[PDB]
Symmetry: C3
Subunit: 336 residues, 3 copies
Amino acid sequence: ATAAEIAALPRQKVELVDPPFVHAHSQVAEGGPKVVEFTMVIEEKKIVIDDAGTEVHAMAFNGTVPGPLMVVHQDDYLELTLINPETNTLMHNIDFHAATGALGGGGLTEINPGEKTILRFKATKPGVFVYHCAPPGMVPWHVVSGMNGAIMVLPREGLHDGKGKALTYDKIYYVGEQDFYVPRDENGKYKKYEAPGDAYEDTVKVMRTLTPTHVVFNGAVGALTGDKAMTAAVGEKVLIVHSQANRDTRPHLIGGHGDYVWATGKFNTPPDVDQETWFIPGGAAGAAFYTFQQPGIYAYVNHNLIEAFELGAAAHFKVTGEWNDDLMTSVLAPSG
Amino acid sequence: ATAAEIAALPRQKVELVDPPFVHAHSQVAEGGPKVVEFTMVIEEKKIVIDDAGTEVHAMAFNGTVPGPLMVVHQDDYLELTLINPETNTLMHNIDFHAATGALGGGGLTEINPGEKTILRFKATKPGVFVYHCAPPGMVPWHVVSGMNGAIMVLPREGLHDGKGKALTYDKIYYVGEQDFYVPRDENGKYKKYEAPGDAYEDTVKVMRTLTPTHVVFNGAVGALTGDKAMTAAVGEKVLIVHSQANRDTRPHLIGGHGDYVWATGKFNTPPDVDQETWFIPGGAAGAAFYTFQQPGIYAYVNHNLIEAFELGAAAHFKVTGEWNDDLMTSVLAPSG
Amino acid sequence: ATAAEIAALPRQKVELVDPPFVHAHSQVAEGGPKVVEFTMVIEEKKIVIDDAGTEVHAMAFNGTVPGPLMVVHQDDYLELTLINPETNTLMHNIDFHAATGALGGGGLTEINPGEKTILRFKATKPGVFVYHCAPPGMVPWHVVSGMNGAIMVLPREGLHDGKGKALTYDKIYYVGEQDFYVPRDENGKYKKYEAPGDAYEDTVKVMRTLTPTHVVFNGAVGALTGDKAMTAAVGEKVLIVHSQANRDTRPHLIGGHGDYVWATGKFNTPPDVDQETWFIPGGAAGAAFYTFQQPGIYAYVNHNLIEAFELGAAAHFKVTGEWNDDLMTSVLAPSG
Ligand SMILES: [Cu+2]
Ligand SMILES: [Cu+2]
Ligand SMILES: [Cu+2]
Ligand SMILES: [Cu+]
Ligand SMILES: [Cu+]
Ligand SMILES: [Cu+]
């Protein structure tokens, strides 16, 4: 498009919603290309990540780990106002894997406390994509402090299967998975620090072992379990977007499947089908489409089961509806 | 199908065999849907996993690690009778990744020592799928104690390539890959225990390092070598089913290739072709189809070579037949 | 082909060049099948792998880590003269993942110091493929000492996308990624050894942790930066071949994408498209095609960002040309 054509595009502000929920959007694009405007304030804050009171100095887009999911369509522009309050102590920026140029935007968005910036980029490629902070020389430290999320760039005509039939979800969730590297003292007790920088050297030592102390969904062990389980109903079509900005994961819906899975996260790459466990490499997002067929509690996990059940990477779905004995039945219940 | 309709279907009892062999089955389905009946007894036993006499307290479906391969066709019903003898000390169950509902069957199959259960599920999705024990709160412990296997759900019309051309194997082998986490004492010597519960706390500490002490095929270092090397002949078409219930693997046939590889293990996802090394995420099974073209010894490995050759993930094939000098020849043998 | 027919084929002697560059070749095959001849001398040599002066006793095909990229076309014969000079101390050989039989050639190429051998194999399958040394009983040690590279077997008609359209690159680079396992003293400083053998036992200990101390491109931290940065221009089409003989990687062009990615490295397997981060399992090579659209500095990384920025797996591209404000623009530069 020419300069006048770009300047003439409608601008639309969108209010964000905290994960695993997702802001208002249409699957099929509404009108022609738009400049979709988002604002996020960066928060540095101590968060508790497990049932033992373990603290991380989180660095959180919009105050959440992961940062919120931003949704646009192919050939829209995403225009982000990024704000770094004066109360923060570190410089931050943002790299969109969906974007082209300047390291994904990081080169143009380096903001000190008390600064803001506005970045626009054209969303040329459909898919789910990681975004993360990336201050030169301190990239993994910000990322593993929770400073990452994802965006979804929908095809203008919505999702389709590998044969071109439309796939329309009834709901969408965004599960961001976070590897944390929390230092311990010589007694094995997790350490606490006054300021984020105080933890830097000890944390890098743990990072270098390549062994996270915690692997969590939505910023904490059990954050998506119990009264915070995700929900669905038999017959409901759900899209589950999953990201991991730094480390591999292998999502699995225990009791279900990935009917269609864009394992690479990219909608122009045909989805795998009938998946038991899919694979998302560190630095990427993926998306799975499932139609629920049975009610009950499902577990949604990283299927390294030590990571899932010892280190924190397990969520639940609570699903309503009628049991289907054709699909599964207890012929003889546990009996002596 | 209605309860009445299911009750009218033919029943077929199958006799399971120990991996890497696979029970008798037909590639193309014989007739319409059947209820295919299997029985497995769970055995808690000591296994020796290396030539240093290192022991694991195995929890073994049908008495083997991995548990045996069960073969059915799409839209058959798999009806498993699972038995936990009074000689065992723990509760066990079974989760089939192929199944839909109740956490893959685990919620309906919890059996104490002295109990049995019968589970029926519809095999709706064609592929190879992991199955494993998953007692709530004790999931990875049972899985990494060897309590896992796989099933194959064949398309009713047998296997095909990505273009509908039939693929018919002459032999099939099932390689179950197992990560073990064996505790060591102060001198770096592996510990032995006189009950499974005695090993628990020490084992969990090792598991949390995410670093297995051993990574093995068929339950031990060297299991599938020598007296247990897999066999083929030049011209023979072989299907190698490979599973890993907890941890990623990257199978490779040294001296050969994966001509067709269902890396995700799902037959409706077209196979990759001409593969050197494929990738199976933890919590999944995959399958590779190869036609042998050269005689001699092949090594079949997880191609993290430290895992293969230091930790134990190496099998052999012995292949008979005529050498092909067109494919490969020593123009000058090693010499001055 | 018969011995007589192979003897009748043209011979072409290629001069190898050091990575990341690739010897002169044609994308589309010139004429019929040929016997393409290469020579490599193995050098056991001390190399420095970081700015601190950390040493590795490398085992290097053609004196480089990685070994150089050999390029042939499908159904050519690759004829390698491999020389193990008398100045070396170990037996070495070569395993080509591209080849069929005798463990990829390793069974036929075991050469002691002072010996040479000539191996010929038919390049039957198009793709990029790892090659590596593999002396029985000493396999991972040679590989993680740098004794690996890759070859490219181009289709005779050059590259095409998934849908039959020709893809022609302007330039090609070969990034070999190496995991090193360097022993540390009680202060945590890297140890130096007088002879390669002195390092063996200490190195195997580190190898067993499955945690490399360094993960590097072209043999050292920062090897492909500064005046050794890779280069391109806006509009230029670049193929990046990436290998890892022992351990998984997840390549990512920061600021860019993988427009077409043969993640499995095999050209008959349709490429993934629009990739943010792709995945290459240990024991394989992959290839990505990208057309640059923005000038400036890019980082090409393994997107486990700890591995990239702490352990060494980061390269740079310097890209000339005109900035595209349609694709990305700073609407408001960092400001109060
Ligand atoms: Cu990134
Ligand atoms: Cu499972
Ligand atoms: Cu190899
Ligand atoms: Cu940041
Ligand atoms: Cu069990
Ligand atoms: Cu060697």
